[PDB]
Each structure stands twice: as structure tokens, then as C-alpha cells.
Design a protein around this ligand. Structure first.
Ligand SMILES: CC(C)(COP(=O)(O)OP(=O)(O)OC[C@H]1O[C@@H](n2cnc3c(N)ncnc32)[C@H](O)[C@@H]1OP(=O)(O)O)[C@@H](O)C(=O)NCCC(=O)NCCS
Ligand SMILES: CC(C)(COP(=O)(O)OP(=O)(O)OC[C@H]1O[C@@H](n2cnc3c(N)ncnc32)[C@H](O)[C@@H]1OP(=O)(O)O)[C@@H](O)C(=O)NCCC(=O)NCCS
Ligand SMILES: CC(C)(COP(=O)(O)OP(=O)(O)OC[C@H]1O[C@@H](n2cnc3c(N)ncnc32)[C@H](O)[C@@H]1OP(=O)(O)O)[C@@H](O)C(=O)NCCC(=O)NCCS
Lengths: 273, 157, 273, 184
């Protein structure tokens, strides 16, 4: 009653900017859901609205969708898929299994997109040439994130990388960071044939290029979005598809409880302590 | 009205109970005997739901189904005429009688040692009036080289 | 070396059926990634490959994408978004915040899709007519999951339901369970205006119809995918987008650590126990 | 400021009963922390206060601590420890690794305690004798939760079981369900 009459002022403890469910219609960052669907804005457009509050151009939305498709799954041997499979075979529900798989996504697994974007952006923002960047990384004892494949070396490129590169070339207006990364890739492939631009490095540099050149973000907005972990979100959302697929697959195969073999574990315990 | 032949080159078997080593030895014997297909078609285990279990056909992997109830395995494997019952002495009687409820099974091997003699008598009566041969209880089984092997008969490879 | 020479057999402890990464090309359920991209499969097609190992028709993929879009976010008031915002304001990373939000998804929050699909499938498979089904639900004192919303009702419909229903009307070949749910909705709305079909109930019944009538599934395959929680996965994947958007929003707004006000908590403690 | 003058009423959206920290002294379910420490409670007593809001006798607290000790770890081969190790080797922090391990705790892994207690209590509450309970579980094709060991058959008993059972013998006032399970 006091709030209705205006006698009392009480600060709101929460601020939100991505969605408004109070009104007659659901609104995604200023755009009603009917307007979202009438404008044929797919998953990429809704993702742009909910993550950046921007109506990205159609090519940007399609590129985001492609980035989600390429990172959807990469087999069951990776740490996250392994954990999801273990949790599914332990009889847990979908949320627990997917969550257990996702909790491994960090620096060593899944952080290559964000790390590669940060490294290439840091090099490109400074004036150092690609060769100076390669020599600086080598001198610091740091491998270039987003460079290096296990098998794909030369004349047999990574096909996901080629698909994303073709889309970025024929649709993006300007990709300075992609050109910088490709010069770095030329240098490193001169060093060693398999040191090609990963899907992680390509996605990172092309995402930075999209943020900086789609015409929707200022330089500081794009820098902030890269810093707060938008590419981590891209990888997590993409890989959630594969993790849920793995959970469903283990449920359908009716796999039983997993126990790791004792012969694969090296028990090295203190003798007396 | 029993049959004069009970193991064949193309015979199939249902194993009652979870005996992975026994059926794996069966499959090794089948592969070495140049059998076209494995002799164990399915397994019955009341304490786990229907699923499939990995086994080695020579150097490759195959899936043998495991059923809660004898009824389902009986239905979807009409080519099976042999049942190897690894049920203990307490459940050998019920499992054997339930198997004798099905006419496709002509041979039943009973492995359990220590079945009371009266229950064994009733098994003999049911088998005799059903025309089903019984490799008697408290046995290892039997082996027809090149065709079939019961359980742990003859050891491993 | 022994495996290469074939002298040793060791059983494989894991089975997978959704993705193969060992070869030259990444494969999504027996389908190469370039073949995925060249015939304009979207997130829906990749989702179908990874979750069902099936080549879904185009309208099924578009409907899956629409389902992921409509469930993307529903404001910060819901339990999962609340938890994600609290964890984000506590200085945690994207994975931890999204995970804390997702772990609330279950029976009470987000589980109406799977429960609605299960109940409507059970009612339709049995011979009970919609009126008999409503009466039987009334007798047991069990609410029909997928029926009833607070703000929206007849004459002010839920527009997400309208969009999804229109797509299913003009694209799906046959929707028996949707028609059954519509009859139940008519009965309940004549009983009471706010008892309309939810987005959860609509998505559940239309997903069952899509599985049973797209031609890519047998009856028992569709039944087992419904049973193992494919709709749980649909809701979780949809809402992960909104939760990541909330995390990015909270990081961009630089919101501080949250503590619930004491005046909102009712302390009722033992006397000296 | 209007709340400091008693001019506004607002309903409380949350209820809590385990701990009060607004006041000068921390209170664990009606008991101050100094009172908790001065009467030589331990992990078990604080656990009883926080989970049950009850003053458990000293033997109950010691038994709870023993239960925490025996279930502390069972090697790295189990599902939860495996997941924790995988997440730790992936470079994640302590909370994420422990979380990823804990999320496998459920029916197949770690739920044998609750399932065993539930089914033994359901049998004991009914009048069925242990023999009839065994036959009933056999008929439904359902193994008895809490029965079974890969090793430790006879004359070499499981030692954690031995320690806990001996403590429950020599300290508990009455163990009806334990005797029922022992007959089973
Ligand atoms: C408890 C129960 C699983 C007994 O299991 P079991 O089949 O007798 O033995 P296990 O399942 O532990 O495994 C059998 C073998 O695998 C071995 N094994 C166990 N873990 C292993 C690992 N990580 N790596 C390699 N080998 C392992 C065991 O040493 C054992 O060896 P053996 O074949 O030489 O005896 C069974 O009786 C049961 O399910 N009971 C229901 C009650 C219950 O669930 N109790 C709670 C569990 S604490
Ligand atoms: C959505 C929901 C929580 C709103 O319920 P609500 O605000 O309490 O609705 P009401 O104010 O009408 O109160 C409940 C009354 O309507 C009836 N009712 C409410 N939801 C019902 C349902 N899903 N099926 C049948 N009857 C329902 C109750 O019988 C009750 O009747 P009464 O007032 O004669 O006792 C409720 O409809 C519900 O639980 N729905 C099922 C779960 C669900 O669909 N989840 C939401 C998906 S987004
Ligand atoms: C520890 C430290 C936060 C002191 O806190 P403070 O800012 O003086 O006061 P608090 O943060 O406790 O909270 C402010 C007031 O709101 C009140 N309050 C706290 N939580 C509340 C809640 N959930 N609901 C309502 N009121 C609350 C408190 O009673 C406090 O009372 P005050 O007005 O007498 O100060 C500050 O000295 C500090 O940051 N030091 C660094 C060392 C450190 O981080 N220690 C960790 C603490 S375990």
C-alpha cells in the first residue's frame, strides 16, 4: 500500500537488461517475441539480443549459428564428454550429467577460443607485426593459442576451419584480425606444416572481427564483451548440445555404472605416514 | 518323445543367470570350432532389466541381449532349443519348470549341485512327459566338439 | 604394438554413437561436417543428428530451433535466472554461474515440458476421451501439466504458444496429440479462463507429434526418447542461452555481491535445542 | 528508515530454522557457538544441531562422526572420484572439481545408504520376518540394498562394518532394525 501511494522508496536489489516478462508480451532486449520471429531472426539473432542487446546483421547471426554448429561436439574422449558420460552411466538426470561435463570447461579444456581471441587481440592492438608476435611468443615460452592441429597440416586443411573461413571471407565486411592471424599461420606453417589455425583460433579471431566490424559495437563494448567471456559462452552453449547428445546416447544404450580399472591407476601411497 | 540329436553345428542356447566367463568360454569354443554364428543367443537374469552385454567373437565385439524374463527371450529367439541353467539349488527347480513351459527347448542342462531329490523327481517327470532331455543336475555339462559346449565343460581355450 | 599386431584383445569400456572425431573429418552421427553445412542444416539439424542420430526433415529442424528460441529466457525472476545472477554477482565465472542456474531445472522449474508430454501421451494412448481425462485428473487431485497460466488466459493469449501453434498447424503433417491437448484446453477454459495451454504443454505435445509423425522414428524409439528426457534437454539448451545472457548482463552492469535482506527472512529456531 | 520507525509491514518470503547470525552471537539452532564449544561437541554435535535441530547424545554424535570417517573416501576408481580427478586435471578450481565429482552421487553411486535404510525400514515396519523379506525381494527380482561384497565373505569380515557394528552394539540403547538386518 505504501509503495502504491508513493510514501516509501526502496532500491531494487536486481538490475536486468536482457528480457522483460512483466508485460503483455515477452520482450528480448527491447524486441518483442513476435517481432523476433517475424523478422526471421534465428537462434543467432536471439543470442545476439540476449547476450549483447544488439540486433546483429543477418550474416553475424548466421556466423554465430555456424560457430555453435562446429563446436557442438568433438567425440567422447574429451574431459567434458567423459564426465557427462560417467554421470549418465551413474543414473543421474540430464541436468546433473550435462553440468558435470560443463564444470570441466576452463583453461585446459574449452578455453582455447577465449584465450586465442585474447592473445591475437592483444598482439594486433599493439603495433607488433606477425613475425614479431611469433618471436615474442616463442621467447616467452608460450605456445600461440589457436595454432596447431594434430593431423591437418597442408593440402588437407581442417574442414571446419575452411567452412568458417569461407563464410567470414564472403560475408564479413572487414576482418583485420583474421588477416593478422592468417599471416601468423603462414609463419608457423613455414616452421612446421601442422601449425595451422585451429577452429578455436579461427573462431576467436573471427568473433573479435565480427564484434569490432559488424557496426553494432564500439571498440570498448567489443573489448568488454571479449573480456567478460562471451566466447566462453559460445563454446559452452555449443558444447552443451554434444553433452546432452552424449547423455541421451548413454541412456539409450542402457550403459551401466562405470568403475575405472585398477590397472590403469598408479597407486603411490606413503609407506607409514 | 525325446530327440536323437541335441547338439548341432547351428544350435543356439539361452543361458539362465549372469555367468560372463562361462558364456565367453562358450563363444571362444564356438569361434575356434569355425561356427558361423555364436551358440549363445541371449541370457536371462531377473535382477537387471533388459539390455545388451559385450562379448568377443574371436577378435571382434558382439552384443548378446540380457532379459529380465524368460518369456521375452523365448519370444524373440525362436531358434533356441537349449537352455543352460546356472540357477542355484534354490531357484533351479522353478527356472527349469518355467523353461519346460516352452516347447522350443528340447535340452536343459542343470549345473547346480544340491537339489533335493524330490524336486529332481518332479523335473524328471515333467521332462519325460514333455519330451525334453535333461543334462542332470550337479554336472559341469557336456561337449560336442565342433558343434556345442555346455558352460565350463572342458575348461578354457 | 600388441593391439596393432592383433595379439591382444581388451574390451572397450565405452560406447558412443553420436560423433566420430578420429578420422580426417568430424562426423555427426554418420554424417560429415561438410555435408552438414553444405545442405543448410541449422542448429536444429545438428541437434537432431546429435540427439536422435536421425536426418530430420527441414520443418522439424525449424520447429526445434523455434522451441529453443521461445524458451531462451523468461526474465530474472525465475529460480534458475535468480541463481545464475546470484552466482555471477559473487565473482564466479560463466560456467559456474550457468551451472548454478541450471541445477534448479527439475520438477518444479522447467519440468513442465516433459511432464506435460508424458501425461498427454499416456492419456492419448489409452482410450480416454479429453473430457474423461480431465475428470480423471480432477478425481486424483492432480493438475494437468501444460495447462494454465497466471498472466495470460483466453482473450489475452500467450503469444509464444500462438507462434508455435501456428507453425505446427501450417507445417506438421499430422498432430493428433496436439488436437487432443486442444480439446483438453477447450474443456478447461470453459471451466475457467486462465487454464489455457502453456508454452510447456504446447512444446511437449508438439514435440511428441514431431517425433511420432516426422517419419524418422518408430513408435518405441519416439517413446524412449520422450522417456529418457529429450524435452528436458530441449528446455535446458534453450534456457542456457538466457542464463548466459544474464551472466553477461550482470558482469557488464558490475553488480556487487548479493546478500538477502534480513527483513525478508523469517527466523524460527528452537528454544535451546 | 521507515523500518527503523516501525511504519511498514512486509511479509517474509523465506523461513529458516538452523542458524541465526543477526544477533551478537552466532546461534546453531537455538544454541550459541560458545555453548556449542564449551560442552565438547564435535562435528557430530554441530551436524545434529544444523540438520535435525536436536541435542543428540554424545554417542550419537560420535557415531555420526564415525559414519563420516568410514565414508570419507573409497579410492579413485569410483565414478565421483573419477569425475573429480578429471575436472582437477582440466585445471579447474576446487569448488568446480568437487562439484563435478559430487554430481554423480545418486542412485547407482552413493545411494546405497539411503536405499538400504529405506527398504530395511519398510520391511521391518511391516510384520514380515527376515526370511519372508528375503523371499519377497527375490520374487520381485530386486537385490537387497546393503547386502553384498566382492570379498570379505566369512571369517574375514569387512572391517569398517566391524568397527561401526561394535560401536553400535556397545553404545546404542536399542537396535531393533540392526538386529533385523543381521538376521537378514
Ligand atoms: C555389492 C555388490 C555389487 C557385490 O558386487 P560383486 O559383483 O560381488 O563384486 P563387484 O561388483 O565389486 O566386482 C567384482 C570384481 O570386480 C573387481 N573390481 C571392483 N572394482 C574394480 C576396478 N575399479 N577395477 C578393476 N576391478 C574391479 C572386484 O575386485 C571383483 O573382483 P573378483 O571378480 O576377483 O571378485 C552386489 O552384491 C550388489 O549390488 N548388492 C546390492 C547392495 C548394494 O548395492 N550395496 C551397496 C554397495 S557399497
Ligand atoms: C501454472 C499454474 C502454477 C498456475 O496455477 P494457479 O495460479 O494456482 O491457478 P488458479 O489460480 O486457478 O489456482 C488453481 C485452481 O485452478 C485449478 N488448476 C490450476 N492449474 C491447473 C492444471 N494445470 N490442471 C488442472 N487444473 C488446474 C486447480 O484445480 C485449482 O482449482 P480450485 O481453485 O477450484 O481449487 C498451475 O496452472 C499449474 O500448476 N500448472 C501445471 C504446471 C505447469 O503447467 N507449469 C507451468 C508451465 S510454464
Ligand atoms: C568485514 C567487512 C566487510 C566489515 O563489514 P561492514 O561493511 O563493516 O558491514 P557488513 O558488510 O557486515 O554489513 C553492513 C551492515 O549491514 C548489515 N547486514 C549485513 N548483512 C545483512 C543482510 N543479509 N540483511 C540485512 N542487513 C545486513 C550488517 O548488520 C551491517 O551492520 P552495520 O550497519 O553495523 O555495519 C569489512 O571490514 C571488510 O571488507 N574487511 C576486509 C576483511 C574481510 O573481507 N573479511 C571477511 C569477512 S568474513
Amino acid at each position: 500500500w505504501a509503495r502504491e501511494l508513493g510514501l516509501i522508496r526502496k532500491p531494487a536489489s536486481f538490475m536486468t537488461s536482457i528480457c522483460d516478462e512483466r508485460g503483455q508480451e515477452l520482450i528480448y532486449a527491447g524486441m518483442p517475441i513476435t517481432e523476433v520471429f517475424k523478422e526471421e531472426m534465428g537462434i543467432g539473432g536471439v543470442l545476439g539480443l540476449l547476450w549483447f542487446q544488439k540486433r546483429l546483421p543477418k550474416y553475424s547471426c548466421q556466423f554465430i549459428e555456424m560457430c555453435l554448429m562446429v563446436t557442438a561436439d568433438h567425440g567422447p574422449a574429451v574431459s567434458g564428454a567423459h564426465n557427462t558420460i560417467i554421470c549418465a552411466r551413474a543414473g543421474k538426470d540430464l541436468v546433473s550429467s550435462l553440468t558435470s561435463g560443463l564444470l570441466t570447461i576452463g583453461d585446459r579444456f574449452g578455453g582455447a577460443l577465449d584465450a586465442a581471441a585474447k592473445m591475437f587481440s592483444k598482439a594486433f592492438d599493439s603495433g607488433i607485426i606477425p613475425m614479431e608476435f611469433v618471436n615474442k611468443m616463442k621467447k616467452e615460452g608460450k605456445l600461440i593459442m589457436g595454432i596447431g592441429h594434430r593431423v591437418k597440416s597442408i593440402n588437407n586443411p581442417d574442414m571446419r576451419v575452411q567452412i568458417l573461413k569461407d563464410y567470414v571471407r564472403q560475408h564479413f565486411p572487414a576482418t583485420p584480425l583474421l588477416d593478422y592471424a592468417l599471416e601468423v599461420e603462414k609463419i608457423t606453417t613455414s616452421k612446421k606444416p601442422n601449425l595451422i589455425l585451429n577452429v578455436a583460433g579461427l573462431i576467436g579471431v573471427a568473433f573479435v572481427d565480427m564484434l569490432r566490424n559488424c557496426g553494432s559495437f564500439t571498440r570498448e563494448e567489443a573489448d568488454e564483451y571479449i573480456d567478460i567471456g562471451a566466447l566462453n559462452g559460445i563454446f559452452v552453449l555449443g558444447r552443451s548440445m554434444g553433452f546432452i547428445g552424449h547423455y541421451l546416447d548413454q541412456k539409450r544404450l542402457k550403459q551401466g555404472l562405470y568403475r575405472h580399472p585398477w590397472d590403469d591407476i598408479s597407486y603411490v601411497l606413503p609407506e607409514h605416514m | 518323445g525325446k530327440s536323437t540329436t541335441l547338439f548341432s553345428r547351428h544350435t543356439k542356447a539361452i543361458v539362465w543367470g549372469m555367468q560372463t566367463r562361462a558364456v565367453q568360454g562358450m563363444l571362444d569354443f564356438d569361434y575356434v570350432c569355425s561356427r558361423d554364428e555364436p551358440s549363445v543367443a541371449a541370457m536371462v537374469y531377473p535382477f537387471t532389466g533388459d539390455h545388451k552385454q559385450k562379448f568377443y567373437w574371436g577378435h571382434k565385439e558382439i552384443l548378446i541381449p540380457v532379459f529380465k524374463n524368460m518369456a521375452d527371450a523365448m519370444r524373440k529367439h525362436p531358434e533356441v532349443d537349449v537352455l543352460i541353467n546356472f540357477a542355484s539349488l534354490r531357484s533351479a527347480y522353478d527356472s527349469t519348470m518355467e523353461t519346460m513351459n516352452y516347447a522350443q527347448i528340447r535340452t536343459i542342462a542343470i549345473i547346480a549341485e544340491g537339489i533335493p531329490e524330490a524336486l529332481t523327481r518332479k523335473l524328471i517327470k515333467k521332462a519325460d512327459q514333455k519330451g525334453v532331455t535333461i543334462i542332470g543336475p550337479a554336472t559341469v555339462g557336456g561337449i560336442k566338439p565342433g558343434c556345442f559346449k555346455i558352460g565350463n565343460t572342458g575348461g578354457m581355450l
